[PDB]
Each structure stands twice: as C-alpha cells, then as structure tokens.
Amino acid sequence: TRPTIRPRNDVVHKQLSAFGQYVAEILPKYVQQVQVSCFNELEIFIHPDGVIPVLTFLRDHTNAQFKSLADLTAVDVPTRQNRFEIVYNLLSLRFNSRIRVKTYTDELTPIESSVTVYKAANWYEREIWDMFGVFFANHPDLRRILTDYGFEGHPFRKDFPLSGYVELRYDDEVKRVVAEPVELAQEFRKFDLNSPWEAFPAYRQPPE
Amino acid sequence: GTSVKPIFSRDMNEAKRRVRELYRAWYREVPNTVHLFQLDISVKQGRDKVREMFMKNAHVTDPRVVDLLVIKGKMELEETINVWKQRTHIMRFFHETEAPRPTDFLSKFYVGHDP
Amino acid sequence: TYKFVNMREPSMDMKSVTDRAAQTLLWTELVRGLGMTLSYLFREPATINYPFEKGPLSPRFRGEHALRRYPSGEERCIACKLCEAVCPAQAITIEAEPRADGSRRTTRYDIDMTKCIYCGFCQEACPVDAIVEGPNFEFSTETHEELLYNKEKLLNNGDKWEAEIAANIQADYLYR
Amino acid sequence: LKKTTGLVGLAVCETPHERLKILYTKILDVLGQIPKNAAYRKYTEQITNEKLGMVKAEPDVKKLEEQLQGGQIEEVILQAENELSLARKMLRWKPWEPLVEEPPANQWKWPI
Amino acid sequence: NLTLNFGPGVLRLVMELSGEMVRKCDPHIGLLHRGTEKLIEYKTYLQALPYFDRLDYVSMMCNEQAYSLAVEKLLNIQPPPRAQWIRVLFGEITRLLNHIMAVTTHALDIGAMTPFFWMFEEREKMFEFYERVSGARMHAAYIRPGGVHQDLPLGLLDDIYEFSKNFSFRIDELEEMLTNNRIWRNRTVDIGVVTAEDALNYGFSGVMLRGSGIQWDLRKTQPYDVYDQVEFDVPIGSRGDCYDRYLCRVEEMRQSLRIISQCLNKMPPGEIKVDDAKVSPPKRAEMKTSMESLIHHFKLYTEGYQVPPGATYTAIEAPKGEFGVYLVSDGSSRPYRCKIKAPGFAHLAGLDKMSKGHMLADVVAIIGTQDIVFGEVDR
Amino acid sequence: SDAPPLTLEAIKDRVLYVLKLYDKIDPEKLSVNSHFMKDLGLDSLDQVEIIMAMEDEFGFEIPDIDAEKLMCPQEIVDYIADKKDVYE
Ligand SMILES: CCCCCCCCCCCC(=O)SCCNC(=O)CCNC(=O)[C@H](O)C(C)(C)COP(=O)(O)O
Ligand code: SF4
Ligand code: SF4
What we know:
Keywords (chain C): 4Fe-4S, Electron transport, Iron, Iron-sulfur, Metal-binding, Respiratory chain, Translocase, Transport
Distance between the termini of chain D: 60 Å
Number of helices of chain D: 4
Bound molecules: the ligand CCCCCCCCCCCC(=O)SCCNC(=O)CCNC(=O)[C@H](O)C(C)(C)COP(=O)(O)O, iron/sulfur cluster
Shape of chain D: elongated
Radius of gyration of chain D: 19 Å
Order of helices and strands of chain E: EEEHHHHHEEHHHHHHEHHHEEEHHH
Binding site for [4Fe-4S] cluster 1 (chain C): 77, 80, 83, 126
Radius of gyration of chain E: 22 Å
GO molecular function (chain C): 4 iron, 4 sulfur cluster binding; metal ion binding; NADH dehydrogenase (ubiquinone) activity; oxidoreductase activity, acting on NAD(P)H
Strand content of chain E: 5-15%
Binding site for [4Fe-4S] cluster 2 (chain C): 87, 116, 119, 122
Oligomer: part of a larger assembly
Enzyme class (chain C): translocase
Helix content of chain E: 40-55%
C-alpha cells in the first residue's frame, strides 16, 4: 500500500479480538456479538438487560477497568423493530484502550439508567430522552435539557421534520412571543445526490 | 404472547390511578400558576384547558403509552411550578394569535387546496 | 514526560519566614504588579486610526460576493449550478434558460447574504471563476431586504470591484 | 515513607502488603462461591493468584510497584477493592448463565 | 434557604443557597442549541465541515482536525506529511488562542481586566495568521478530510517565527499580573477541588483531569498526525483546584510555543492534500485541462465522495479537553449520524458537585476554570 | 365556642351545598342517594374534582384509593363521619 492509503495495525487488531473473546466468555448471559473494525475499534453488542452488569464489569474488572465514559448517545433506525440503538464509548487509561458497547430499545421499552456506574451518564441520558424519547428507568431527574420548554416531539428522530412544526415571533397585540405553524419564505431544497453504480463491492448485500 | 416489559403500571387500573394523581396535581396548581405568571385568563378557563389537554389523550388503551404520557405531564407540571417556563410558554396552550381554521367543506374549498 | 506546576515546598528557616512576613506586611508583589501596569502605561498603544487606517488583509480574504465577466464584457457564469449545489447554507438560488443567441446563461442568480456563511466554497467550486468573494467587507445595511442580492446587484459588484478582484486572483491563483 | 501519592483524594497507604494480602484473600473467598466452570471465576482467580504471589515474594515497595505493572501501590489497593465489589455483584448477577434471548432477525445489520 | 434564578457566554443558573453557602447549583442549557447534529444529516461531508468551526468557536482549527481525522479513518486514507505538520502547527496556535481566551476571561470575571487587552493583541496577530492562510479570521474551514485546502503563502513561516519568539514575554507579563498576586490566589486556591476518582467517574478530560494529578494527555497516549514526532512536557497539578488548573494552562501555552518552534523547524516539502482525486479535489489548472480532473471536480462538488459504511469514535486532545466525534456512515456521500462529544458538557454537568459548600462568587471562578464555551455544549 | 359540634345533619348540609356549587350538576336533579356516574352523568375526572372540593371544604386529605370508591353523597358522608367519628 502506497502513501495515500491508511496503514494497518495487526497487533492492535489481534489484541482487541482477544479481549473481545475474553469479555464474551466472561459474560455469555448478555453478550450477543463481538466485532472489531478494520481500523481497530472493538464493539460489543449486548442484550438490554445487561447494561448495568456489563458496564460495571468493564469499569471494575482488574483486566478491563474502563474507568472513563467518553460518550453516550443513540441512533435512530426506523426500519428496525427496535428503533433505537444505545451506544456507550468507554476509555481505559490503565490499558490505554477504548471500547464500544451497543444495545437496543424501542419507543416504549425503558432502559436501565447507568448513573450508578458512571456519573457522567446523568446528562447524556437526559439528552437522549430529549432527542429520541428513550426513557431511562431510575434516573435521578429525567427532563429535557436541550429543547425549549414545552417543546413537543423529539427532533433527532428520523421522521421529525428538519424545520419542525412551530416557529416563534413577537406579537404586539398580545405583547409577547408567540408560536405559530412553520411557514418558510423559501422551502429547503431537497437534493437527490445518491448515484447509481454502487461504490463499494465489499459491502454488497445478497439480492434475496 | 405479546409480552412486553412494563414502565410503571402492570394494567390499565394502575395507569388510571396515576392519571388521576397527575390530574389532581394540575388542578391544585392552576390558581397559583394564574396568580404567579400574572395571566389574564381565569382559573376556570385554565382548568378547562387542563381538562381539554387530558381529554385529548382519552382514546389510549395501552398502559405503557398512558404512563409515558403521565411522565411527560409530570415533567410539564415540574416546569410550570418551578417557574422555568415564562408567560409565553404557559399562554402557548391557548393559541390566541392564530386565526381560526374553519372545518366545513365549503370554507376549505374556498381558501385553498388543503383538506 | 510531565511537569509539576505546584510541587514546591517553602523553606522554614528564619530568613525565609521573615521574607514572607515582609511580603505579607509591606505588600511587595502588589507593588510589582503596579510596576508592571506603570510600565505598560508608558509604551506606545497598539490602536490604529480607523477609518483612516485599516487592518491588514490577504489576497485570500473573502468579502462581499461578485459576478465577474470576460475581458470582452460577456459574463463568465454559464449556469452549471455547482456553486448552488455545494453551498452549505443553501444561500444560492439559480434559474437558467438559453439566451436569445443560444448561450447558456442564468436568468436568476440570487444570494441570500443573511444565510451565507462566507465559507468561499462557491468560488472554489466554480469551474470558470464566475462567482468570487471580493475584498469588500464594509457593506452594512439599514434593512434586511437590501441584503438579498439578485443578479443585477452581483454584476454591479463585479463591475465595481473587478480591478482589485483580478489583482487578488493574480496574486493567489498559483496556490489553487 | 513517601508522601502525596500525587492523585487528589488518594491517601498514602502505610503498610500496604498486609492490606493487599487481606484484599486478595477476601477476593479468593468470594470467588470460591462462584461455580467452578464459570469463566469469570477462573480468570479472576488466575489474576488474583499471580498478584498475591508477586506481593508475597517482594518486600520492597518500589520493586513491587514495578512488578505489579499498576504503579502507585495505593491505586493497586483501590483496584483490588473494586475487584472485590465487582466479584460480589457478579455472584449476585450470575452472568455465566446462557444468553437471555437473541436479538430480532436484523437488529444489528448495517447498512440499513 | 433562598432560590435565585440567574438568567441571561449565555447561561441560566438556578441556585438554592443557605445563607452565603451554595447548597444546590442547577445549570439550564439549550439557549444555544441549534440542532447541528440533525442539520449535518442533510449535508455532504465537505458541506458538514464548517459546522465544526462553530461548535467550539474559541478554537476552530482543532474541531476541523477532529472531524477530518474521523472522516479519514472512515475513508481508509491518510493525509500527506506536510498537511499533517501544518495541522499540528495550527492546532498549537489554536491552543494558544483558546488558552489566552480562557485565562483572560477567567481573570476578567475575577475582576482583573488588564491582561485581557494585553493578550487580545496577540490574539489579533494569530487571527491575522488564520486569515492569511485561509481568508477568514476565525471561521476558517481550512483543515479538510483530505489534508488542508491550500498551501501556506510564501512568507507565513517567517512571520509566525517572528510572532512566536516574543510571546514568552507576554506570558511572563501575564504571570507577573496573576500567579503570585495574593488576591488572585485567595480567589483561586482551594476552590473547586475535585478528586482523581471523581474526575474520572464524572467524565472530565484535559486539564480538568491533569489538575488532580492524573497523568493523561491524548497527544502522548494516543497520538494523531505527527504528535509523536514532537517533544514537550505535560503539566500536572497537585491539589485539583482552580489555581493548579490556571498554572497548568499557563504552562501548556509555553509548551505549545515549544511545539510550534519544532513544527517551524521541521516543516517538510510536498503536497498538501492526498493525491487521490476521488477524495480531494484536483488543482484548478488540472480541472481546466484534463477530462478526468474536470469530472472528479464536478462530482466532488455536487455529490461528494462516498464514505464506506461503518461507525467510528475519533477523539483528539483539544484545548478544552477530549473532543470527539461518533460518525456513522451508511455508504453514501452524506453521514447517517454525527454525534459530537464536547468536554464542556461533562464539565458543566460536574459543576453542581464542584461548587458544593462554596460562596456565590466562587461559582464564577469554577465556571471560569471549567473552560465552558456554550456552542459546543448545546450544539 | 371555638368549634361547633358536628352532626350528620351538618355534614350532609355542607356536602350537598358544595355539590350545589358544582356547576355541572343542577340543584333540582341531585339527591343524597344519587349516583355520580349515572343519575347525574359524570366521568371520573368530575368525581376527582368533587373529591378535591370535599377536601378543601372539610379541611383534610382523602387518599386516592378510598376517594375513588365514594360514588354518592351518602357514602361521602359516611366516609367523612368514619374519618371524624361523629355521634349523630
Ligand atoms: C394552564 C393550563 C396548562 C395545560 C395543562 C397541562 C396538560 C397535561 C396533560 C397530560 C395528560 C396525561 O398525562 S394522562 C392521559 C390520559 N389517559 C388515558 O386517556 C387512558 C385511558 N382513558 C381514561 O382513563 C379516560 O379517558 C379518562 C377521561 C382519562 C378518565 O376516565 P374515568 O373518570 O372514567 O376513569
Ligand atoms: S460563501 Fe459559502 S455559504 Fe456563502 S454563498 Fe458561497 S458557498 Fe454559499
Ligand atoms: S457562478 Fe460558477 S459555479 Fe455558479 S452556476 Fe455560474 S459558472 Fe456554475
């Protein structure tokens, strides 16, 4: 591979694969899948019931001790029966490593709050609740953190429109800021950019 | 089958109990909200608005949806009591600046193409 | 390697303790700060005499947009809509049709200057150097409406600033 | 004896060998109640036995810090306490049991 | 027990106080939530780049680098060495700008306003460097996911060298104003003490870790670009308070000067973006002479490059702490998901614990020492 | 006297008076044994408002679980008496 191509690292790949197998062996009750990406990133797909145990293990085990929670977020995939996927990114300073833990939920199934494992989760789950409508059970105080007071809906959902449903202005008759249905002087221009002639043969799906 | 994990309530009866508790809290809070925000509405029409908002969701027959709505209503009450909302947020429930939309067929036919 | 910022132990001999007591009572470090301020009072200020003097700028600086033309006087824009396609803010609106002589030219070229982020992506996406971001930055306005530029305004800006725009392009085009 | 381990809130531990021995013995006692075939029990017993043998064969503190590869024996003690707490919670959780249930058919398929 | 709502960077703060003591501090945010992450889903990767300038406005260059690194990792390409050296040089310049802003503002809020002007003159000079390299003073969009947009002008390195050999005296003047002043120490020493364990559990990063004695720095532990080719020291605190963090920041600026010197002396020749026209756009002359170059220019500026499907979490050692991006590509030319991780989010979430049992006037000092920029926190 | 003696008659007069104040029940149609849902045509929320009126008229708190079963003025009076332990 020539200078324009990102170099590979087989040593880290082997180490991450071995540790993924190790984690899957220790907790077979919850670990559904283990993957390592070609750029050496380890993800562990677990059942929703194992959020508190697995995280606790990854925080407290002598061989793991992932003591830092870098980020916690959600991804909305409407085609799946379980709509939302919950992603935890953890960092271990002792072993200079990163791990990703993935689980899933739908609109109505609550997910156990992990504030007892990581304090940093407190706001993150709140943001998820604000943006995706995922409820976290036993959260110390769950409420909106980013949207306006009284905002209806969850904007980061795929079916939520980009400009929303209401807009704000100042009305002199009532002498205050009011909210009315959105009306754009220029509509957002939707661009169809995806080309035919697929780009990456290595990701081709079976034709079923 | 069709077995699902609960949120707060196992059947509809517990859900209605939670709904009644939230309704009591809102009904109690309405006069204090009217006085604190210096609203020009009356307590009667504020309680009518609370009743209308509750009745908007009267067709729900799923306890999980019911107690999720109860959670959202409790969040709204928390925002109102702690005066995190302003007067504009409270008055947004009334839509005082919106011209009324007629419902009959002829008026909709006259104004435009929108059903 | 790493460094300690606050890992010094004060000496406990009588001379050092007396020095610290003298600092505490006679306010030595406060006088040092006063001296620093006094020294700053007597140096030349860094203020420039705007608007008679102007801050330095570069040929790469992006200012008010302009539509350029060829030396013959015909406009460079051929309505490819690449600038409209790349615009991160959707600030460009273009409509085009064949001209009376069959040329491929625009009939509408609007830039909403209150949506523009002045990123310069349009001028680098342009294949013919038609839309540029010219050196002018002093075009404030009393109303929102005068910041919604149509094609006539942009062509006028180009005819107004062409000399400086061409000089800047001559300076910087070997880097592009 | 050194002072100021350098981490705010982490106290200097006088006589750390006894504390480490007690903690590792308690960890092994807790691990004894986990089923013999569970992977967590075998792995943690192996790690704890290695660490206990290394603390028993090294009286010098700094040599122990270098051998343990954790450094700052106070945080080694802290990690041992964390491991004990995790061992108790794992004996409660029983994660050696078979998987609760598989995900839906295309839960993890990407793209789409 | 009285409750005060200090309303409207822009921050709303609801406190309960028992007398002079702060019993509870609750920050209400979202006054600058613009929905950046949703808007990114309607843009190409190049079109999404300029949002990162606006995320953390104080240090625009660093966010560009983090986004470019994430996209490069997903693309399985690497930037040319000269681009990497330019990226690191401008990242250290960016760090100086952020540090000057954080330190002067902290001092200004504390009531010392003189060094704000003194060091904003230097900030103006660094804005001049930004403008000369990119055409914009602060919202630059210079660092791209293939390298950098343009090469340096022919006289920029000399001017950067001239600027950097006089900056240590400015830092010395700032210290003369601050470090040994008894009022400054009384305002900062033993304020907002956080333990190492609490800092790790609360998600803190950057100086907020290193003030408590945690030896961690992403440029040393997980180097990106050429940070493994430069030599510098990581300042470490001992008491976890505001004074130690101020010292660490001041020390960091000096280290940044050191790294800038090394970058200036070891700038290599060569190209500035990856020689791959399906990712980086070609040169103008090539675009106007070659059919393939024109086609690739057209496609890269209309559709954009396709990124192979996959998700990455890329973090860099930002001036304010660990700044990260969780990027999910579905295989098209528009990102499926872009979650932005901001250090200030966790720091502000920890403000409540940090301000326990302090004066009301200590809350200002703690907010200043957390280095909070609202745009990144709200996104 | 600081507090007048309370009897079943006084409790009933207070209860039917505060029902008369309720604007969704006209005075001529209600009675002591009139059921809330059928003879007067009220939903659960109307009953809940009536219970709050009971609470702020008699100056004490009625838990939801036992407040939900008071479907008549008569059993409301019975609940008030049992909570207060009146003689007549
Ligand atoms: C100033 C004004 C401010 C605005 C006020 C705030 C608005 C908050 C509204 C939130 C509503 C909820 O959370 S709760 C949503 C309501 N729940 C349900 O509808 C479930 C099943 N339906 C029923 O039980 C009946 O419709 C019912 C009539 C409810 C009872 O009837 P009974 O009597 O036969 O029991
Ligand atoms: S400078 Fe950027 S935002 Fe402004 S019109 Fe050009 S492409 Fe659009
Ligand atoms: S200004 Fe340039 S890029 Fe835009 S439509 Fe005209 S020729 Fe194309």
